């Protein structure tokens, strides 16, 4: 009683009912390094200007 699969059926993406657990770390990665501080604030004018040599602004 076997019916031959039609064109376009064996190439389908199907779902699998499995009871095997999903690997939590399949890549065996290390812990990612901590990011840079990402400072935030509200801008204020540069103190006493550019402070480059004799320039007062």
């Amino acid at each position: 009683g076997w019916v031959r699969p039609d064109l376009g059926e064996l190439s389908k993406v199907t779902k699998v009912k499995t009871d095997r657990p999903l690997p939590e770390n399949p890549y065996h990665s290390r812990a990612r390094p901590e990011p840079n501080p990402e400072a935030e604030g509200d801008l204020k004018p540069a103190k006493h200007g550019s402070r480059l040599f004799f320039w007062t602004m």
Binding site: N36, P37, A39, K47, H48, R51
Partner: protein, 70 residues
């Protein structure tokens, strides 16, 4: 008469010198601090400055790759 019509009292120049000295000393200490901060950031790279680009991770394709083992 000359002092009244051409010049001012010692207080003005005295306190102007006080203010000028205060500004210049602050600028000097700011310059020294800025140099030290630059040295530290260039040495460790943990600051906002001297940040050199690395590969963007949004370019990685996370999909099956015709082979189970990547």
């Amino acid at each position: 008469w000359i002092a009244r019509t051409f010049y001012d009292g010692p207080e003005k120049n005295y306190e102007k010198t006080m203010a000028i000295l205060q500004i210049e000393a602050e600028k000097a200490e700011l310059r020294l601090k800025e140099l030290e901060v630059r040295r530290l950031m260039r040495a460790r790279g943990d600051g906002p400055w001297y940040q050199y680009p690395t590969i963007d991770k949004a370019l990685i394709d996370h999909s099956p790759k015709t082979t189970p083992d990547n």
